[PDB]
């Protein structure tokens, strides 16, 4: 019931330093050891840090881990950032003997200039509504780094019901694109006066709204 | 010859913290694979040693201290801590090398109406030194009028009772603590892994 | 050098039973804990459970009711059984070796490469195309089409039989709760050519050999 939450994404230019925080909630992080995994796409996770700060044999010393009890946090620090370091990073501890993982953080080693997303929100079609269905479609394209979060709002109210977002995929121009689909009932679409798509990229949030 | 960890974990009874029990482990091979309490430990942390390496490390002596405190006191069973348990009941040295293990024993050490067999020292004239035990019962003088063995105003009995009802908050539930000490003092090694 | 592989099953129907085997090459199960870890597509990691040389297990409470891990010191293998399977059990399944004390695994040093397990009850459906029309005519209105509920993947999308190539962005697919996919493709054209040029999206779903052509107009 101990929760480990990590940032969704973090990014930095090569040769600089990055850190990945992992905050505990509903308990104390210092009571068990924290392990850190690196997962390069398409491969299994490997450990880079174990027992808060120990490096397995073969892991460069530029991976280092730390615990900040003042804020119930562990942190993975990677210095002299190389591009081989691009991956998802998972922190891992325990809740009474059961392994607890974190959300994962996707680390992007910036190898391209930074591009803000282009989001286009389409309302349910008049044709789809005659088939007794209603699908809101959020199209986000051309952003770097390849990581976003999406939150749907119905009449200025959080909605996580029929929301289903995708994993950012790489385009032909080396930028990234992703989609989110809010499935509604045709009555719910007309019962409210405004639905909104909010996309978060890096630290800036862009929002687009639609109404019947 | 096997190390007797089972009587440290699967022990039916546990000491009170003021009278904390110490088991001495020597001349045995340690089977670290056993899942004691279905490995259901709320706290599991070493200082100095790496649990990862213990299967192939040898020691001269392993001391195993065990007792019972309440949930929000387990924080104090760690190096460089202060508080009633650390000051007056069980103190770890800043140079501690060994493991602190704790699990919730509400299912064992809680009675309807309260289990009152577990005690702790609430008053003491000065802080304990590391690994000191104090089983005194002298009335503690909390004022200027001397206490001639009479409890009363400004005259307190130094042990108090944890009241463990099964409906308490978790911070007030009984926890069993085991503290392993790994010594390597210029002597032959007697305790190893396989 | 010690190495692991897991294998089995792969295509499952809801309610069936997942069975995987993990083989250990180059060591034995002594003084190591042996876990199964799974990762749903695009999601994070989840520990299923472990087993020690003696055969004792400790399971994740989220699955305990339906999960079994079993050892075979003779064939140098250990196995996973996941009963009453659901679509939420679709993931990549890993076996991993662990190091630690008293059941607390403090370092997981070697992992297998992983096997995928898909739980679906879907047959080959063809896409159902809908138009995404533009709103009030910054100077470049975007119109697209929604390609809903097809199986399996993929679906290719072109615009105007290939001639339209400027702002075409055809996005990746969601997997909905039905077990079917939904695509989308958009084109950003100037607002002036919204009454002058006809825009048609051409869908192809080579699995069911369904081709659809649909025109997208404003209002
Ligand atoms: C005590 O030890 C045995 C093995 O010797 C174990 O199976 C059992 O779960 C332990 N705990 C008890 C009996 O509460």
Numbering used by the authors:
A (entry chain L): 2 to 27, 27A, 27B, 28 to 66, 66A, 66B, 67 to 106, 106A, ...
B (entry chain J): 334 to 527
C (entry chain K): 1 to 82, 82A, 82B, 82C, 83 to 100, 100A, 100B, 100C, ...
From the paper:
We isolated a panel of neutralizing anti-receptor-binding domain (RBD) antibodies elicited upon natural infection and vaccination and showed that they recognize an immunogenic patch on the internal surface of the core RBD, which faces inwards and is hidden in the “down” state. We observed a continuum of partially overlapping antibody epitopes from lower to upper part of the inner face of the RBD and some antibodies extend towards the receptor-binding motif. Class 4 anti-RBD antibodies mainly recognize a patch of the molecular surface conserved between SARS-CoV-2 and SARS-CoV.
IY-2A’s hydrophobic HCDR3 (sequence G97IFGV100A, Kabat numbering) intrudes deep into the hydrophobic core of RBD, surrounded by seven aromatic residues, two leucines and one isoleucine, including F338, F342, Y365, Y369, F374, F377, F515, L387, L513, and I434. This blade-like HCDR3 is strengthened by the hydroxyl group of Y33 from HCDR1, which forms hydrogen bonds with the backbone nitrogen of F99 and G100 on HCDR3 and the carbonyl oxygen of RBD residue Y365. The observed conformational change is consistent for all four copies in the crystallographic asymmetric unit, and the electron density at this region is unambiguous. At least two residues of RBD (Y365 and L368) are brought from the buried to the exposed state, while residues that are found in the interface with other antibodies, such as Y369 and N370, become less accessible when IY-2A is bound. In addition, the LCDRs of IY-2A interact mostly via hydrogen bonds (e.g., Y32 of LCDR1 and D51 of LCDR2), and unlike other class 4 antibodies, its LCDR3 only has a minimal contact. The IY-2A footprint also overlaps with these residues, but the conformational change induced by IY-2A flips the side-chains of S371, S373, and S375 out of the binding site. Other mutations in Omicron BA.2 and BA.4/5, such as T376A, D405N, and R408S, are not involved in the IY-2A-RBD interface, except that T376 is somewhat close to S30 of LCDR1 (~4 Å) without forming a hydrogen bond.
